């Protein structure tokens, strides 16, 4: 997938044992309720973790009240979400942008 999102998707749905379409259409859906971006992903990783939101958004935000980098938080949630290490969950992200 193209554009930094559609990645992020993409490895959302393989967390969670669902298709791309299905995440993407949850996505586009939540965000028509008028939710930013950023809070949905975060919303969809929860889901894909089986955690609560409020305890993925507050990670979230304390990671970033820390200094690191958002789409550097969100590929570490990811790894969490998986089970996989976050070398694994970069590396992937990286690829797939690639092409
Ligand atoms: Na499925
Ligand atoms: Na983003």
Request: no cysteine; proline share 3%.
């Amino acid at each position: 997938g193209k554009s930094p999102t559609e990645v992020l998707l993409e490895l959302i749905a393989e967390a969670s044992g669902t298709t791309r379409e299905e995440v993407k259409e949850k996505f586009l859906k939540e965000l028509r309720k008028g939710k930013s971006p950023t809070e949905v992903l975060l919303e969809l990783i929860a889901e894909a973790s089986g955690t609560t939101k409020e305890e993925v958004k507050e990670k979230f935000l304390k990671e970033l009240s820390f200094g690191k980098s958002p789409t550097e938080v969100l590929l570490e949630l990811i790894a969490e979400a998986s089970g996989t290490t976050k070398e694994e969950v970069k590396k992937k992200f990286w690829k797939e942008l690639s092409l």
